[PDB]
């Protein structure tokens, strides 16, 4: 899987980025068994002020996680994984859970390529 | 919902970003009744020249809106909402509608978390 | 279609970006018939160090291609296109295939607008 993590520039220090990536990676392995080396966390930084909520410009605290998964997991597992990411990213980033959004999209494994190989 | 808005750096001034975010937020609530605070507009700026169309490098005028939605709306409502975003973003950014692309993706509410809470 | 191409800043020279964009555009048309002008390649650059794999911070070599397509192609064509993108991006960027990830998402044409008009 690939987790696109949308954050404001400099909101996360290198060690906070590492903590967040580890927290997402460990969530994605503890619950599903997805091996460590399969989890990509890709931080997309933008200047603070580029996020609007209800048309109101935000500071730099919002985090949006868009997880891109292969189809086939149960709704229970996906809901548990999403909640685990909220909780563990909240801790690793020192950010209130209310600032964290997490969406999971899914695709057939047959149209997903990782490390230049098709997914099982 | 989350609207990822892919624009060139400095193509939108702070007031143009606010107008675009308002136009997208107002389209969404005016057609589905999603509360204001539920609409995130997330601007992703890149240097001009990073967009290619048919392999031809573009200037800074392209706008691509990727809307990430809960499943369950009718094809008619989604089409109306996409068309409204084209029109109102065209006005708010004073940019030809031919430069505006809008795709909607959908996911089960059960794998979507906003403000650290699951969606209905 | 829109291909979002996530790369590290300055990993691709302007001529390498053009080559990658051409390679993706040519894959898309040569396999499906998608007309030249219909293919948008949108490069999203981030500082090297913003990609983590298995929690390990990466250099600037990863490439992730997120293709956004209209529904309706066969699984065979989609897999052929993804494999073709891996191969031709590998050459055009002179980058090991093992650094290239390619995911395809699909949506109904009825909720996709290109050049300010709805898709067939």
| Backbone φ, ψ for residue A119 (5° rounding) | -80, 145
Which residues, including other chains, have CB under 8 Å from residue C66's CB and lie 6 or more apart? A2, A68, C3, C4, C6, C103, C105
Question: Which tokens hold the place of A46?
Answer: 């933008």
- Quote the CA–CA distance of A1 and A25 in Å, as a whole number: 9
| Backbone φ, ψ for residue A31 (5° rounding) | -95, -30
Name the experiment that determined this structure. Answer: X-ray
| Backbone φ, ψ for residue C29 (5° rounding) | -80, -40
Residue B35 burial class via C-beta count within 10 angstroms: exposed 0-12, middle 13-18, buried 19 and up: exposed
Q: Which domain covers residue B82, as residue numbers?
A: 2-118
Which helix (H) or strand (E) segment is B72 a member of?
Answer: none
CB contact under 8 A, C50 and A17: yes
Q: What is the CATH number of the domain that holds C23?
A: 3.30.429.10
Which residues, including other chains, have CB under 8 Å from residue A20's CB and lie 6 or more apart? A5, A12, A41, A43, A89, A92, A93
Question: For chain A, what is the domain count?
Answer: 1
Q: Which partners does chain A have (≥3 C-beta pairs < 8 Å)? A: B, C
What does the DSSP assignment read for B28-69? Answer: HHHHH---GGG-EEEEEEE-TT-EEETTEEP-S--EEEEEEE
Residue A108 region by backbone torsions, left for phi larger than 0, else alpha for psi between -120 and 50, else beta = beta
H-only helix segments in C1-120: 14-32, 75-92
- Quote the CA–CA distance of A63 and A46 in Å, as a whole number: 11
A112 to chain C: closest CA residue: C103
CB contact under 8 A, C110 and B78: yes
Q: Report the residue from C25, C43, C108 with minimal CB separation from B46.
A: C43
* SS3 category, C67: strand
Residue C120 burial class via C-beta count within 10 angstroms: exposed 0-12, middle 13-18, buried 19 and up: exposed
CB contact under 8 A, B113 and A103: yes
* Nominal resolution (angstroms): 1.8
């Amino acid at each position: 899987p690939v987790y696109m993590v949308y954050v404001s520039q400099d909101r996360l220090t290198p060690s906070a980025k590492h903590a967040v990536a580890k927290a997402i990676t460990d969530a994605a392995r503890g619950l599903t068994g997805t091996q460590h080396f399969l989890a990509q966390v890709n931080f997309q930084e933008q200047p603070a002020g580029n996020v609007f909520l209800g048309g109101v410009q935000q500071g730099g605290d919002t985090i949006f996680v868009h997880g891109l998964h292969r189809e086939g997991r149960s709704a229970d597992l996906k809901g548990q994984l999403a909640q685990r990411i909220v909780d563990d990213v909240s801790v690793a980033a020192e950010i209130d859970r209310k600032h964290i959004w997490v969406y999971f999209g899914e695709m057939p494994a047959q149209q997903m390529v990782e490390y230049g190989r098709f997914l099982p």
